[PDB]
Amino acid sequence: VSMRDMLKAGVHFGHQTRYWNPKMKPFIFGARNKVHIINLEKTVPMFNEALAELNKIASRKGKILFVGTKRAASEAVKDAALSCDQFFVNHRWLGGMLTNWKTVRQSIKRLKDLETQSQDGTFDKLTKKEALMRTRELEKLENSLGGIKDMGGLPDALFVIDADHEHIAIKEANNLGIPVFAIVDTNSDPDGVDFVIPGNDDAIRAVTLYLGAVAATVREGRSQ
Amino acid sequence: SMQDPIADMLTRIRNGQAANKAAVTMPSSKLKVAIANVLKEEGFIEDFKVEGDTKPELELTLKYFQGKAVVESIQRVSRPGLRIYKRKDELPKVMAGLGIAVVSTSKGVMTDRAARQAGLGGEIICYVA
Amino acid sequence: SLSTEATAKIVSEFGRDANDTGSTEVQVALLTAQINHLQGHFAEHKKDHHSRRGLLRMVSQRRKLLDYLKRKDVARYTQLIERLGLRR
RNA sequence: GGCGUAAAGCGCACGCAGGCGGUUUGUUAAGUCAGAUGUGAAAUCCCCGGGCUCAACCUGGGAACUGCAUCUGAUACUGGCAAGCUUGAGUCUCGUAGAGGGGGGUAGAAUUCCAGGUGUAGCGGUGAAAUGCGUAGAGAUCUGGAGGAAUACCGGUGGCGAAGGCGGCCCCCUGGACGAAGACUGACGCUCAGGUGCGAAAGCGUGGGGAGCAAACAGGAUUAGAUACCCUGGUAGUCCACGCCGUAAACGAUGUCGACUUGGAGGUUGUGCCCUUGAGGCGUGGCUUCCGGAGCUAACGCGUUAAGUCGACCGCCUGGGGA
Numbered sequence: 001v002s003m004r005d006m007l008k009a010g011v012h013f014g015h016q017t018r019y020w021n022p023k024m025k026p027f028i029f030g031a032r033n034k035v036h037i038i039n040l041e042k043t044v045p046m047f048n049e050a051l052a053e054l055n056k057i058a059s060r061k062g063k064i065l066f067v068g069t070k071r072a073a074s075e076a077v078k079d080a081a082l083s084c085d086q087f088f089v090n091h092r093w094l095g096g097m098l099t100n101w102k103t104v105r106q107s108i109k110r111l112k113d114l115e116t117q118s119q120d121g122t123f124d125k126l127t128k129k130e131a132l133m134r135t136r137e138l139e140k141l142e143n144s145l146g147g148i149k150d151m152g153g154l155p156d157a158l159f160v161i162d163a164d165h166e167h168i169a170i171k172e173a174n175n176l177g178i179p180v181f182a183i184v185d186t187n188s189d190p191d192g193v194d195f196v197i198p199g200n201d202d203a204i205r206a207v208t209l210y211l212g213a214v215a216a217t218v219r220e221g222r223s224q
Numbered sequence: 225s226m227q228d229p230i231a232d233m234l235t236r237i238r239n240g241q242a243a244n245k246a247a248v249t250m251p252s253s254k255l256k257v258a259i260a261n262v263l264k265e266e267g268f269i270e271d272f273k274v275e276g277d278t279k280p281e282l283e284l285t286l287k288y289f290q291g292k293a294v295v296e297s298i299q300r301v302s303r304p305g306l307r308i309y310k311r312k313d314e315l316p317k318v319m320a321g322l323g324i325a326v327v328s329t330s331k332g333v334m335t336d337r338a339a340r341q342a343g344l345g346g347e348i349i350c351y352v353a
Numbered sequence: 354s355l356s357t358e359a360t361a362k363i364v365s366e367f368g369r370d371a372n373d374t375g376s377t378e379v380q381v382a383l384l385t386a387q388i389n390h391l392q393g394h395f396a397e398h399k400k401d402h403h404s405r406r407g408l409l410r411m412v413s414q415r416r417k418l419l420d421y422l423k424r425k426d427v428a429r430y431t432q433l434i435e436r437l438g439l440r441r
Numbered sequence: 442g443g444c445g446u447a448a449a450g451c452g453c454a455c456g457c458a459g460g461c462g463g464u465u466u467g468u469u470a471a472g473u474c475a476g477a478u479g480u481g482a483a484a485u486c487c488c489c490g491g492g493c494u495c496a497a498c499c500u501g502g503g504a505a506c507u508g509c510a511u512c513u514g515a516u517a518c519u520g521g522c523a524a525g526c527u528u529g530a531g532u533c534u535c536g537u538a539g540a541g542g543g544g545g546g547u548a549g550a551a552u553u554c555c556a557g558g559u560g561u562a563g564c565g566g567u568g569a570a571a572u573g574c575g576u577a578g579a580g581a582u583c584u585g586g587a588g589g590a591a592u593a594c595c596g597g598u599g600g601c602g603a604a605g606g607c608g609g610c611c612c613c614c615u616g617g618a619c620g621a622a623g624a625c626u627g628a629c630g631c632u633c634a635g636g637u638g639c640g641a642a643a644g645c646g647u648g649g650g651g652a653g654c655a656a657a658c659a660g661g662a663u664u665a666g667a668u669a670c671c672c673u674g675g676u677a678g679u680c681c682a683c684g685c686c687g688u689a690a691a692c693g694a695u696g697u698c699g700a701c702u703u704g705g706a707g708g709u710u711g712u713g714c715c716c717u718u719g720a721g722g723c724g725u726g727g728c729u730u731c732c733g734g735a736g737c738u739a740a741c742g743c744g745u746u747a748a749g750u751c752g753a754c755c756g757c758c759u760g761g762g763g764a
Contacts, residue, residue, distance in 0.1 A: 022703045022734075225529065225631045225699050227462045228752045232700055235751040239701045242735080242750075248701085251528070253464070255518075279528055280464095304461055305753065307519065309473050330474055330515040345474050347518050354615090357534085364533070368625090374533035375625035383532070394543090394614060402639060403542035403602075407616040409455065409638080414531080416456095421629040 001047060001213055003040050010203040012038050014186035024186050027198035036186040038198050047210075050181050050195035051217040057157045057179075058221025065148070066211070067169045068161030069093060073207040077161065080211035081147060084218045087155065088147035089169070098154055098172040108149055111141040157181060159214055162201040164188035183210055229253060231300040233260075233282075234350055237269075240286055241293040252280035258333035259349060260284055262326050266335060268295050268352055297353040301325075311345040323353030355387055367436075377422045378433050384415035385437050 006012070014020070014028070014036035029039035058064065066081040066088040068074065074090040081088030089097070097104055115138055117123055123131075158173045160166045163182035170192045173180045182193040183201040190196040200206045226232065233256050240248035250256070252274045260272040260282065270285035287294040301316075302308040310316065310327075315336045318325050325336035329346035339346065355363075360383065364374050367382040391408050395401065419439070423430040434440050 018705055020704085025703085225462070225753080227631070227699080227754095229463070229700090231752050236701055239750055243702050245702085250700090251463085258517080278526075300751080302518085303752070304519090307472085309518090311474070328473095328517045330517055332517050334517090343475070344515090347473070349518085360533070370625085372533085372624055373626080375531075375627085377532095377626065377629075380532055380626080380629095391615080398543045398614070401543045401615070404614090404616040405542095406454080406603080406639080410616090413455065418531085418629070425629080 001044060001051070003044050005209070006040055006043065006199075009209045010206045011043060011199040011209070012040050013200045013203065013206075014038050019187040021187055021189055023190055024184065024188070024198065027184075027190075027196075028186060038186060038200065043198050046195065047197045047199070047213070050197050051213060053179070053195060054157060054159070054181060054214060055217045055221040058218040059224055062156035063087065063151060063153075064214075064218055065089065065151070065155035065158045066214075067093065067158055067166050068207070070162055070165060070202075072202060072204050073161045073211075076204065076208050076211050078147070080215045083215045084222065086218060087151045090147065091143050093166060093169050094144060095168055096172070097148070097169070098178070099175050101154060104145065107141060108145055111138065111145055111149060114138040114141065154178065160193070161207055161210070162188065163190070163193055163196075167192070181214075183207070228300070228304050230255060230259065230349065231303060234298050234300050237284065237286070237295060238298055241295050244288075245286060247283055247285045249281055249283045252276070252282035255328075255333070256282055259326055262324075262333055262335060263352065266324050266352070268324075295352060297323075297351070299351045301348040301351055308348045309346060310348055312340060312343055313345075315340050315345060316348060316351070318351045319353045323351060326350045326352065355383065355390065359386065377418050377425075378429065381415055381418050381422070381433060382437060384411050384418070385439070387411055388415070 012029070016035050017031055020028070020036055024036075027039055027042045029037045029041075031037060054064065064081075064084075064086045066077050066086060068077040069089065069091055077088050077090045080086075081090075094104060114134060118135065118138060154176060155178060158169060158178055158180045160170060160180060160182035163170060163180075163184045164187060166182075167189070170180050170182065174192050179194040180192065181195045182188075182190075182197065183199055184190045184193060184196045185199070185201045188201075190198075197210070199210065229251070233250055236248045236250050239245075257272075257274060260269065263269045263284075264272055268287060270287045272282065272284045275281050275283065315327065316325050317323075317336060321337075326349040327334060327336050327339045327344075327346050328349050329339045329342065329344035331342060331344060333349065334342070336348075361371075363382050363386055364379050365371055368374065368376055368379045373379060388408065388411055391404075391411075395405060395408065398404070419430065419434070422433065
């Protein structure tokens with residue numbers, strides 16, 4: 001949140017001037033070497049407001065859903081969402097995880113049944129061909145739905161990295177009225193998000209800074 | 225060529241409102257300033273200022289409520305190709321009274337309800353809803 | 354078109370100053386000089402329609418300037434049309 | 442209510458009548474507005490009652506008759522008049538790019554033809570053939586000459602032009618566009634029925650010219666037939682001068698003029714700034730190609746060069762045939 005730590009983390013950096021979105025004009029400070037520079041004076045108050053609303057949602061019995069699938073922010077999202085008893089989607093977002101929850105609930109049930117019969121059940125009726133088949137199905141289903149297995153229903157807030165990369169999740173949350181907290185870069189569309197946090201979403205240290213701040217605020221919210 | 229500057233002012237307001245512009249600028253005129261006064265006193269624009277002496281430039285500060293346009297519709301009624309004059313008993317009411325109709329009566333430019341209370345008719349400048 | 358010296362001469366004899374190059378009299382005189390000069394070119398090049406379009410542009414511009422001058426001040430209009438030899 | 446594709450933008454432009462017209466002051470009170478007066482026949486329409494036992498019907502009173510004229514005022518807007526102003530529109534200075542137009546000259550490559558040398562049996566053409574040319578020496582090759590037409594490479598969703606269109610090089614005459622900084626005139630403007638002008642190709646008239654190509658035409662093929670596609674020739678024509686014709690899927694199937702509305706990548710042509718580092722970067726105009734946002738659209742798609750939001754004027758459409 002500290003603008004010095006932000007500027008040292010690489011938050012102010014943006015994409016090239018070609019790929020920019022004109023709707024991101026209020027949050028752009030300028031350009032250097034044909035890449036946009038995000039205005040941190042605009043970034044820190046919006047990030048603080050987003051953190052305040054996230055803390056409210058956490059303290060009011062809420063479920064946060066951390067969404068980010070880029071190879072830069074996958075493991076970071078996993079660590080952040082596990083560090084606060086939350087849920088994450090760090091791999092491919094299945095089209096309809098939220099709007100078609102009544103159908104992916106069955107896949108969650110299947111994943112849970114498979115992992116219980118593998119670990120606690122320990123069928124041992126292997127056949128050495130259906131066993132490896134079931135383990136591969138379990139690993140696919142876990143890489144797809146491993147973060148939201150203990151969610152139960154739809155979350156109350158989405159924290160998205162690279163709002164352009166995750167337009168499907170944002171559109172689903174907007175269809176369901178769930179507030180969206182997205183790290184919107186200079187090339188992304190800030191229309192479908194509620195709490196736009198204009199900052200770099202490609203550098204790894206920037207997303208670790210964002211996720212650490214969000215994890216801290218949601219933990220302090222959990223602990224009231 | 226420029227044959228209707230009042231319709232041009234209305235079009236500038238409409239296009240600046242649709243583009244979420246903060247303020248719109250245009251060459252000034254007495255009738256433009258009167259219509260801008262009528263719009264400001266009715267609450268459709270925030271403020272207006274006239275800058276310059278030999279070439280006055282009128283600048284209207286557009287108004288938004290919920291990130292939405294305050295001026296939903298603004299149309300030119302009386303135009304150079306067809307002039308529209310109305311008597312006081314047939315003055316139009318926009319949006320069943322929720323909108324205003326800028327009327328140019330012999331006592332200056334005013335709204336349709338002000339011209340009705342004053343017992344006057346005249347040229348229907350525009351409809352603002 | 355007209356040379357610089359001929360244009361300067363016309364501006365001087367038809368203008369209220371050596372810099373009054375925009376007066377209606379100066380414009381009409383310059384257009385008349387260009388038309389009279391082009392007359393000889395088109396006597397020899399009767400199939401030059403592309404240049405005759407610019408000639409007719411000059412003619413119509415001079416006509417509109419003369420109409421404006423006659424509507425503005427008829428005395429200067431008469432002085433101009435007698436000094437230039439117009440009125441068909 | 443419409444005109445990109447469903448019917449509908451004149452092929453393009455100039456322009457008279459007409460329509461509309463930047464901005465300020467004064468004046469008038471023509472349009473406009475307000476009030477009053479006169480009139481707007483009665484019946485009818487409508488409202489409240491009355492009489493027919495009810496109704497139809499009859500009838501009292503009122504409202505209405507949205508109109509016209511006159512008189513008295515108002516002056517915001519439109520109009521008239523007078524004086525202004527510079528931002529629209531033009532003039533001048535200096536340059537820039539361009540297949541813009543008209544006239545004359547010239548250059549090279551190639552096709553064809555004529556004459557000659559070498560040389561010998563084929564050449565040409567096709568899916569295959571044949572018609573055709575060739576022992577009278579073809580085709581091939583070499584040399585010289587004649588004539589006409591068009592300008593390889595450059596060459597490019599490049600440039601110029603109102604449109605149609607414009608392509609070697611040189612000279613002569615000539616129109617438009619754009620840019621820099623100023624000076625000047627001061628609404629002189631936009632559109633335009635009728636009118637006039639320009640208007641691909643084909644076609645027509647007169648006089649030339651005629652290499653190549655090629656309607657018609659002839660022959661050889663193919664075919665059931667083949668008045669065609671294919672082949673061998675070939676006249677008009679294509680070319681030039683001067684007239685006529687006035688039509689095209691004359692297309693962006695998108696009239697002209699002006700204002701406003703997020704962006705990206707290019708092309709072309711000026712101009713300004715900076716140790717010019719560089720064939721550099723950053724601005725600022727003109728024209729132009731592709732994609733795409735809001736918006737619009739029946740959709741396709743258009744999208745700052747709008748088919749978005751508006752204003753002025755014009756042309757056009759009203760089911761398919763007949764036509």
